[PDB]
């Protein structure tokens, strides 16, 4: 078994093993996560 | 070149902000775009005007439009005024000294609400960025930020230091604990936005988007984890539009309470809080009526709950104004009458008095006692002009023509007219002629202060343009009926002379200063030049993507400028009609372009609120003038060229006048600070029987622990080798103190194991040689708690792997 | 948008909408202003010749050629209220959850985090609840809270415990929660829960890895014992 994508559409699950529901995240946490994803897709 | 600077600004009575009333009907403080006006209601004259400084057009002046005032709050006792701007800046103003005392910058958007505390030492601000910040006036710092709301802060209530209730555009009502800086309660006030909030003792009223208005009781000391705010009942106001502001006022003599719900429409609805004895009297009566009707007691109880709101509240009276209302405020409460002051979106101040006796008012409608209207115009100015003497400025707007003194800035005369589109003085400065949208031509006399003549059938459509020859005897009028008509002035009345019928609608007509050319702009993106003497077609100018909106001809009749809705200024030569240059001047449609007299330099104004100064020979922009908040509709240049007057959509007439450590070393420093404190406390405690740590607010063990965590693991092993042996004994003492804190031990148990074993391994030889008995006890101790913590984790791991294995066995047995 | 001939068409909601029936048996509610199919009602298996509306379409009756009536009742107002009440409840739970964590009421905050499905908050509740116990598994109250969990909550909780276990920095919280579940539930019942076994498939290999580690750390800890005997000499 290996940690993959979040099964629910409202949650972010990282390969680190930490799950993050979008509801609980602050606006500041969501912004940096979005920018982090933007960096990941850019190099991809 | 010379610089143009804003000499004066006038024509605004109340901008898009609230109004603050101060007792002496007393004075009123209203916003005028970037400046604040103080009016005297009785006289209707401007008392003082607050301007920070830095007039637009100066070199030191900023390069963007100034921030407009959005909210005004004045602490009556301390004689301070707080002003919030559209950029999120709060400026505390000394009303007596008329100067800025403090400047706060903590909001990223426009300020929606300001509120002094009762004592006047702390200021609370809410902004469109959804943050509430509490400022310390004495300390000139932001104490803390309240960041739960997800939209603009519409309203909030804080009458005590302990608690704060806040409303936002996301539809939530939130109770704050000012001592913990946290939100305790959250309820959905309305299905959409929530716009109003007023609190009186336990009673609390909020308004949503629709006509529904909710009632809540505020039991602050409930302390159940819920129910500090409980909804009681819903009452529907007459106005279906959103309710913006709610305000309570109490009559000291009779203890009666009144409030209004300022609507987005032209209505203010006032209400009355029934006294308890009235509620008890009514409750008994309505019970009798329902009981007589044969209803059951349970039904009667439910009905009372359904009609609960009606018991406390009584619709008192509704104020109707001719214009949409921007803000309102209670002025005076008395047994005889109740008074309100409001500002409209159409640039005026209105004062209303409500005489009443007992439950109901005496008069069917409120009494409009005072109004401030003379120094402004209700609708935006569509055209302006300057008299040949450069003393009178005529500003034509929809429904009124007003005339000003450029020196005193005071309107001299007002004339009622139609939807005026173009105005121009006749020579001598004693007459004005208007072109209305209805096709009417109106002529006015200043000395008579009345209209001389009206031509109802001057044109079949809007008279978009109108111009005069240099002699002043001939008038050229262009209209949307696709005709140019020439008129003569004979002793004064206007006589039709000729008609020139063109192929499309006419937007601008200009006559050359030498009276030789006549330039006409058409809706087909072309400008046609005629010979005025013979009316023979001469040239046609092509090159504009969109229709030409303004035309002007140089003083020597060589160049002609055309500005269009395609954002381009094109300079042409009248000799052959060739385009000398096309300038991408503005970011929106360019409405007016004028030559400076006796020079080829010209001005340009556009819908993007910018007035630009250009060089007609070098084709370069000399100066950008950022003063208007919205579209600039009209522009005018003095005959001398000394000043330029511009009027905008914001009701303002502005006059421009010509003037490091590495890993291991950080650990060594951390050990010195932490263990110096630990040893100091140990020595202090034995006898009884720092700045860095206090700033970070961490116990010495945690301060060292955090330093260990930050060290990257690839650097960690090499960082520990650099440490001397003297710091190793310090390290062992730190591990010993950590062992007492079981919470800290297990949180970072693997890390302490890796570090502790590496230290012992690297310098085992020196450790054993030391004959310190105290060190022996530490290692004996550090061993025991280290084993127990490790074994506890291993015991859980060993237990689970066997249990989970057993679960597999039973599922396999039952399913195979 | 109709797959077959349209047999009936009537206006509902005054000018706003239009409802139509077709031989395909499908009743489509359209928006007159935008001309888009807002909803499709499929309760018939044959052509619809008759369609009657009452109270501006608040009640609609359609008769199949087979002889089946469908008495449609408008329920937009009813559905929005259910959403509003659901939304109102969710806002209360969020605020109550935050208050419990700040107060440190981990036993109550645990229940809310499970219902709201907030993993980070659930991890913090369990992590810091464990920290206090350091100073049976978690607490007498919180163990009871875990015990009363139903099958759906257990599967969700074990999924989190599975993911936390993979990371060596967070496995400790996972092991104790699993230990609490095994110690406060019928093991027979846990097996029957569908999908529980596949979740338990993933936990065991990582648990063995964590067990091989830590055990080595116990071996390394005996360097201290060798230090003490040398000092005794």
PDB file of C-alpha atoms in Angstrom, chain B residues 399-525:
ATOM      1  CA  UNK B 399     -32.296  69.445 -15.045  1.00  0.00           C
ATOM      2  CA  UNK B 400     -30.333  72.521 -13.968  1.00  0.00           C
ATOM      3  CA  UNK B 401     -27.841  75.079 -15.264  1.00  0.00           C
ATOM      4  CA  UNK B 402     -25.677  76.580 -12.520  1.00  0.00           C
ATOM      5  CA  UNK B 403     -23.092  79.347 -12.810  1.00  0.00           C
ATOM      6  CA  UNK B 404     -20.100  79.793 -10.529  1.00  0.00           C
ATOM      7  CA  UNK B 405     -17.532  82.394  -9.560  1.00  0.00           C
ATOM      8  CA  UNK B 406     -14.095  80.968 -10.308  1.00  0.00           C
ATOM      9  CA  UNK B 407     -12.626  83.045  -7.474  1.00  0.00           C
ATOM     10  CA  UNK B 408     -15.105  82.435  -4.641  1.00  0.00           C
ATOM     11  CA  UNK B 409     -16.235  79.023  -5.978  1.00  0.00           C
ATOM     12  CA  UNK B 410     -19.800  79.994  -5.013  1.00  0.00           C
ATOM     13  CA  UNK B 411     -22.691  79.397  -7.387  1.00  0.00           C
ATOM     14  CA  UNK B 412     -24.190  82.743  -8.406  1.00  0.00           C
ATOM     15  CA  UNK B 413     -27.316  81.662 -10.295  1.00  0.00           C
ATOM     16  CA  UNK B 414     -29.321  78.528 -11.045  1.00  0.00           C
ATOM     17  CA  UNK B 415     -31.632  77.915 -14.001  1.00  0.00           C
ATOM     18  CA  UNK B 416     -34.024  75.023 -14.584  1.00  0.00           C
ATOM     19  CA  UNK B 417     -33.643  73.411 -18.010  1.00  0.00           C
ATOM     20  CA  UNK B 418     -33.956  70.042 -19.720  1.00  0.00           C
ATOM     21  CA  UNK B 419     -31.339  67.363 -20.284  1.00  0.00           C
ATOM     22  CA  UNK B 420     -28.657  69.850 -21.279  1.00  0.00           C
ATOM     23  CA  UNK B 421     -25.872  68.440 -23.467  1.00  0.00           C
ATOM     24  CA  UNK B 422     -23.825  71.467 -24.579  1.00  0.00           C
ATOM     25  CA  UNK B 423     -23.488  74.990 -23.203  1.00  0.00           C
ATOM     26  CA  UNK B 424     -21.502  77.990 -24.382  1.00  0.00           C
ATOM     27  CA  UNK B 425     -21.344  81.614 -23.309  1.00  0.00           C
ATOM     28  CA  UNK B 426     -22.142  84.318 -25.804  1.00  0.00           C
ATOM     29  CA  UNK B 427     -19.628  87.169 -26.167  1.00  0.00           C
ATOM     30  CA  UNK B 428     -19.734  89.634 -23.301  1.00  0.00           C
ATOM     31  CA  UNK B 429     -20.338  86.896 -20.735  1.00  0.00           C
ATOM     32  CA  UNK B 430     -23.955  87.950 -20.152  1.00  0.00           C
ATOM     33  CA  UNK B 431     -25.865  85.169 -21.961  1.00  0.00           C
ATOM     34  CA  UNK B 432     -25.789  81.374 -22.138  1.00  0.00           C
ATOM     35  CA  UNK B 433     -27.218  79.025 -24.768  1.00  0.00           C
ATOM     36  CA  UNK B 434     -27.990  75.350 -24.167  1.00  0.00           C
ATOM     37  CA  UNK B 435     -28.618  72.390 -26.417  1.00  0.00           C
ATOM     38  CA  UNK B 436     -30.988  69.947 -24.748  1.00  0.00           C
ATOM     39  CA  UNK B 437     -31.449  66.297 -25.610  1.00  0.00           C
ATOM     40  CA  UNK B 438     -35.066  66.939 -26.629  1.00  0.00           C
ATOM     41  CA  UNK B 439     -33.939  69.049 -29.586  1.00  0.00           C
ATOM     42  CA  UNK B 440     -34.667  72.315 -27.773  1.00  0.00           C
ATOM     43  CA  UNK B 441     -32.447  75.395 -27.770  1.00  0.00           C
ATOM     44  CA  UNK B 442     -32.615  77.497 -24.607  1.00  0.00           C
ATOM     45  CA  UNK B 443     -31.103  80.957 -24.115  1.00  0.00           C
ATOM     46  CA  UNK B 444     -30.551  82.469 -20.663  1.00  0.00           C
ATOM     47  CA  UNK B 445     -29.714  85.936 -19.341  1.00  0.00           C
ATOM     48  CA  UNK B 446     -27.612  86.238 -16.199  1.00  0.00           C
ATOM     49  CA  UNK B 447     -28.662  89.753 -15.186  1.00  0.00           C
ATOM     50  CA  UNK B 448     -32.346  88.963 -15.709  1.00  0.00           C
ATOM     51  CA  UNK B 449     -31.704  85.562 -14.077  1.00  0.00           C
ATOM     52  CA  UNK B 450     -34.405  84.112 -16.343  1.00  0.00           C
ATOM     53  CA  UNK B 451     -34.817  82.379 -19.692  1.00  0.00           C
ATOM     54  CA  UNK B 452     -35.266  84.700 -22.673  1.00  0.00           C
ATOM     55  CA  UNK B 453     -36.265  82.352 -25.503  1.00  0.00           C
ATOM     56  CA  UNK B 454     -36.833  78.649 -26.134  1.00  0.00           C
ATOM     57  CA  UNK B 455     -36.962  77.017 -29.570  1.00  0.00           C
ATOM     58  CA  UNK B 456     -38.875  73.773 -29.084  1.00  0.00           C
ATOM     59  CA  UNK B 457     -38.467  72.619 -32.704  1.00  0.00           C
ATOM     60  CA  UNK B 458     -34.781  73.488 -33.144  1.00  0.00           C
ATOM     61  CA  UNK B 459     -33.944  69.866 -33.990  1.00  0.00           C
ATOM     62  CA  UNK B 460     -35.801  66.575 -34.247  1.00  0.00           C
ATOM     63  CA  UNK B 461     -33.284  64.791 -31.993  1.00  0.00           C
ATOM     64  CA  UNK B 462     -30.591  65.473 -29.398  1.00  0.00           C
ATOM     65  CA  UNK B 463     -28.449  68.548 -30.039  1.00  0.00           C
ATOM     66  CA  UNK B 464     -25.155  66.774 -29.408  1.00  0.00           C
ATOM     67  CA  UNK B 465     -23.013  69.759 -30.399  1.00  0.00           C
ATOM     68  CA  UNK B 466     -23.163  73.534 -30.647  1.00  0.00           C
ATOM     69  CA  UNK B 467     -20.607  76.183 -31.598  1.00  0.00           C
ATOM     70  CA  UNK B 468     -20.271  79.923 -32.171  1.00  0.00           C
ATOM     71  CA  UNK B 469     -18.351  81.955 -34.717  1.00  0.00           C
ATOM     72  CA  UNK B 470     -15.667  84.378 -33.583  1.00  0.00           C
ATOM     73  CA  UNK B 471     -17.919  87.361 -34.318  1.00  0.00           C
ATOM     74  CA  UNK B 472     -20.572  85.835 -32.059  1.00  0.00           C
ATOM     75  CA  UNK B 473     -23.389  86.566 -34.518  1.00  0.00           C
ATOM     76  CA  UNK B 474     -23.720  83.074 -36.040  1.00  0.00           C
ATOM     77  CA  UNK B 475     -24.556  79.807 -34.288  1.00  0.00           C
ATOM     78  CA  UNK B 476     -23.896  76.301 -35.626  1.00  0.00           C
ATOM     79  CA  UNK B 477     -25.805  73.399 -34.075  1.00  0.00           C
ATOM     80  CA  UNK B 478     -25.352  69.702 -34.809  1.00  0.00           C
ATOM     81  CA  UNK B 479     -27.985  67.134 -33.905  1.00  0.00           C
ATOM     82  CA  UNK B 480     -28.691  63.419 -34.101  1.00  0.00           C
ATOM     83  CA  UNK B 481     -31.313  64.177 -36.777  1.00  0.00           C
ATOM     84  CA  UNK B 482     -28.390  64.308 -39.265  1.00  0.00           C
ATOM     85  CA  UNK B 483     -28.556  68.074 -39.878  1.00  0.00           C
ATOM     86  CA  UNK B 484     -26.461  71.162 -39.191  1.00  0.00           C
ATOM     87  CA  UNK B 485     -28.500  74.348 -38.826  1.00  0.00           C
ATOM     88  CA  UNK B 486     -27.095  77.870 -38.940  1.00  0.00           C
ATOM     89  CA  UNK B 487     -28.734  80.569 -36.828  1.00  0.00           C
ATOM     90  CA  UNK B 488     -28.355  84.333 -36.491  1.00  0.00           C
ATOM     91  CA  UNK B 489     -28.597  86.544 -33.411  1.00  0.00           C
ATOM     92  CA  UNK B 490     -30.849  89.534 -34.132  1.00  0.00           C
ATOM     93  CA  UNK B 491     -32.265  91.994 -31.614  1.00  0.00           C
ATOM     94  CA  UNK B 492     -32.365  88.856 -28.633  1.00  0.00           C
ATOM     95  CA  UNK B 493     -33.882  86.014 -30.644  1.00  0.00           C
ATOM     96  CA  UNK B 494     -32.584  83.207 -32.848  1.00  0.00           C
ATOM     97  CA  UNK B 495     -33.558  82.906 -36.519  1.00  0.00           C
ATOM     98  CA  UNK B 496     -32.968  79.812 -38.626  1.00  0.00           C
ATOM     99  CA  UNK B 497     -30.784  80.534 -41.671  1.00  0.00           C
ATOM    100  CA  UNK B 498     -29.795  77.323 -43.475  1.00  0.00           C
ATOM    101  CA  UNK B 499     -29.779  73.544 -43.115  1.00  0.00           C
ATOM    102  CA  UNK B 500     -26.961  71.188 -44.109  1.00  0.00           C
ATOM    103  CA  UNK B 501     -28.210  67.609 -44.344  1.00  0.00           C
ATOM    104  CA  UNK B 502     -25.559  64.938 -43.781  1.00  0.00           C
ATOM    105  CA  UNK B 503     -25.562  61.166 -44.075  1.00  0.00           C
ATOM    106  CA  UNK B 504     -25.254  60.202 -40.385  1.00  0.00           C
ATOM    107  CA  UNK B 505     -25.618  61.437 -36.817  1.00  0.00           C
ATOM    108  CA  UNK B 506     -23.508  64.403 -35.713  1.00  0.00           C
ATOM    109  CA  UNK B 507     -21.487  64.269 -32.486  1.00  0.00           C
ATOM    110  CA  UNK B 508     -19.298  67.394 -32.599  1.00  0.00           C
ATOM    111  CA  UNK B 509     -19.209  70.620 -34.609  1.00  0.00           C
ATOM    112  CA  UNK B 510     -16.298  73.049 -34.255  1.00  0.00           C
ATOM    113  CA  UNK B 511     -15.642  76.377 -35.983  1.00  0.00           C
ATOM    114  CA  UNK B 512     -12.092  77.502 -36.645  1.00  0.00           C
ATOM    115  CA  UNK B 513     -10.924  80.621 -34.761  1.00  0.00           C
ATOM    116  CA  UNK B 514     -10.528  82.412 -38.108  1.00  0.00           C
ATOM    117  CA  UNK B 515     -14.092  81.390 -39.105  1.00  0.00           C
ATOM    118  CA  UNK B 516     -12.822  79.774 -42.317  1.00  0.00           C
ATOM    119  CA  UNK B 517     -13.309  76.060 -41.536  1.00  0.00           C
ATOM    120  CA  UNK B 518     -16.129  74.062 -39.960  1.00  0.00           C
ATOM    121  CA  UNK B 519     -15.260  70.576 -38.706  1.00  0.00           C
ATOM    122  CA  UNK B 520     -18.098  68.091 -38.173  1.00  0.00           C
ATOM    123  CA  UNK B 521     -17.806  64.653 -36.582  1.00  0.00           C
ATOM    124  CA  UNK B 522     -20.106  61.902 -37.822  1.00  0.00           C
ATOM    125  CA  UNK B 523     -21.209  58.561 -36.423  1.00  0.00           C
ATOM    126  CA  UNK B 524     -19.577  56.826 -39.418  1.00  0.00           C
ATOM    127  CA  UNK B 525     -16.074  57.401 -37.922  1.00  0.00           C
TER     128      UNK B 525
END
